[PDB]
Amino acid sequence: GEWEIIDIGPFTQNLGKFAVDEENKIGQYGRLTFNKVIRPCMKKTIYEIKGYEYQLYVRASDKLFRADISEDYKTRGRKLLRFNGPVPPP
Amino acid sequence: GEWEIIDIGPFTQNLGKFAVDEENKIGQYGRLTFNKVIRPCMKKTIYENEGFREIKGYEYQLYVRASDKLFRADISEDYKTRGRKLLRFNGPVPPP
């Protein structure tokens, strides 16, 4: 596992939207409206690379949540691993 | 507030010792034996930007292994006073 901080550009905002979409299907937090992914955004590269994990602070419905997203290198499948909160801002 | 990942040498391990020593003083857990601060460790540099710019202090987000479990500890330090404070200590958490 190697870690880096990545920026919060539209590619990163997409992962936030994915987190919210997936959590909305699960329904534990009710109906969330995605607002924004905030800093800091972290990315772990899992090793030859197997895939990645992104740790995000996602603001949905004016609340902040922690979402972890896994991404497989070969298949490019993504999965929401964790989604909890509300948490205070970092 | 600029963030960076910091390495896990003695300064970092002693932030981890701080966190464990403080938590043990609180006593809500059974006695925690400090093992190690693991990667990643994040450092937030807190700047004052209005007027003469300067670094006021730092906040650190740590993963600390203690009694073979992992905990999350956030620590702030004021540079001028050397005031180090345990902002939060939660756990056990799953590994990053």
Listed in sequence order, the residues at least 6 apart from B14 whose beta carbon sits closer than 8 Å to its beta carbon are none
In the PDB record, what is the listed experimental method?
X-ray
Q: How far is CA A62 from CA A9, A65, B6, B27, in A?
A: 19, 10, 31, 35
CA distance A39 to chain B (A): 8
CATH T-level fold of A1-90? Nuclear Transport Factor 2; Chain: A, (3.10.450)
Is residue A40 helix, strand or coil?
strand
Respond yes or no on whether the N-terminal peptide bond of residue A90 is cis (omega within 30° of 0): no
Contacts of B1 in chain A (CB under 8 A): 39
The full 3-state SS of A48-63, as one line of letters, equals CCCEEEEEEEEEECCE
Chain A contact residues (CB < 8 Å to B): 1, 3-5, 39-40, 42, 44, 55, 90
Specify the pairing of strand B2-6 against strand B69-78.
unpaired
Listed in sequence order, the residues at least 6 apart from A81 whose beta carbon sits closer than 8 Å to its beta carbon are A53, A68, A69, A70
- Residue identified by tokens 């958490």 is B93
- Angstrom distance (rounded) from CA A32 to CA A12: 18
Helix%, strand%, coil% for chain B, nearest 5:
20, 55, 25
Contacts of B62 in chain A (CB under 8 A): none
- Residue identified by tokens 């590619």 is A11
CA distance A70 to chain B (A): 12
CATH T-level fold of B1-96? Nuclear Transport Factor 2; Chain: A, (3.10.450)
* Token reading at B4: 């960076």
Listed in sequence order, the residues at least 6 apart from B9 whose beta carbon sits closer than 8 Å to its beta carbon are none
- Angstrom distance (rounded) from CA A80 to CA A49: 19
